[PDB]
Ligand binder design. Sequence first.
Ligand SMILES: Nc1ccn([C@@H]2O[C@H](COP(=O)(O)OP(=O)(O)O)[C@@H](O)[C@H]2O)c(=O)n1
Ligand SMILES: Nc1ccn([C@@H]2O[C@H](COP(=O)(O)OP(=O)(O)O)[C@@H](O)[C@H]2O)c(=O)n1
Ligand SMILES: [Mg+2]
Ligand SMILES: [Mg+2]
Lengths: 193, 194
Amino acid sequence: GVLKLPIESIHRDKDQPRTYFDEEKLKELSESIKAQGVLQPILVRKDGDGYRIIAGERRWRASQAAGLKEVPAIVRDVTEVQAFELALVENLQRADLNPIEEAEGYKRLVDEFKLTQEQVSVRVGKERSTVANALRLLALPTDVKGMVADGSLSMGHARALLGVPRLPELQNLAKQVADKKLSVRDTERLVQQ
Amino acid sequence: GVLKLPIESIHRDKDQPRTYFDEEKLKELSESIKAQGVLQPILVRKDGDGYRIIAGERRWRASQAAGLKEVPAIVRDVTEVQAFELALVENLQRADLNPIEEAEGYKRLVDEFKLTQEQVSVRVGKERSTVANALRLLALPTDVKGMVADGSLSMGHARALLGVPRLPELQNLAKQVADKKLSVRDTERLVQQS
Ligand SMILES: Nc1ccn([C@@H]2O[C@H](COP(=O)(O)OP(=O)(O)O)[C@@H](O)[C@H]2O)c(=O)n1
Ligand SMILES: Nc1ccn([C@@H]2O[C@H](COP(=O)(O)OP(=O)(O)O)[C@@H](O)[C@H]2O)c(=O)n1
Ligand SMILES: [Mg+2]
Ligand SMILES: [Mg+2]
């Protein structure tokens, strides 16, 4: 099943589908690995003097960055066409939590499990600013949170709308922003009142 | 390590962070599982007379819909608080391929590995329209698909810009749309004039 493989025994697939590696997101992944370890084993292929990654290059890099010496892995015996299919499937067959689901998750850790916002940040590997801003979404009214949750309003839109003094005025402005589909800049000019 | 657990011995976590389950995405996941199996074991906790899911409810639902009788799983002995942390980490510590990376992946399966576009849809579990539309992005000029890659141009913005007949004017609208952050509808009106 799941081996613990030395990181030095594993090398990247130079032809893998991901070419861009966001350093800020790699940093968060590394922080989460320090807190929780790697939760899902990477997929590798025997190759050369060791193994070649099929899927899981970020996990491998982040583990290296955190100073871990091994990474959980599943060894797959596959053709390289199938290995490439696996790399696409692993990344493309996912559904993220929406921003309200994320924020309510942080809220449960604080309210129910009695973590501080600091502890949530450390335990999940997310920046303090990300945890704090998600929680602030939950001060919005239901209708407005619904528009954030379904994507009618973006993070940036929600940012600006938190400045509106009156909640009723806040909903109507939010509904226009989503309904007419205004830019974030137009929203902020609107919020100035 | 990884167990094959019977699906009927696994039940969901009613307090898990995800509350919305897109049916189309579950369908796609199920088709990918029919083609490839479950690639990443789900995380479960001993609970009642079976197991509770920590992370992986979609894989579990899709496996049932695919007709599997078992699912790969890792049994974790954790507190309730740690299990909820793991559920959040599993979903929030990810980075998607950008639209161009996705499109070039389909193109490699076709050009290098000699799959048909039909087979790409089957083997990766994506709708035929999704594969076709992604591939159509690669007709855009470098500078434009770079803006698609980094999110300067949305999917709808790219769709409209494919209607521009001349590449020099396509690039100039692309910069104008991305720099001014015009709406999709506005971008469409520009394209028709051109
Ligand atoms: N501490 C962590 C954080 C994320 N993950 C998983 O690692 C994967 C990250 O996916 P990704 O496509 O961004 O990066 P790769 O490692 O696949 O290259 C997700 O499946 C996350 O659930 C983990 O196994 N352990
Ligand atoms: N055939 C497949 C397709 C996706 N997956 C993985 O299953 C996970 C799906 O993530 P998700 O958050 O959308 O759904 P859950 O199964 O975690 O509830 C990703 O880590 C995908 O890489 C898999 O293991 N086998
Ligand atoms: Mg991946
Ligand atoms: Mg998940």
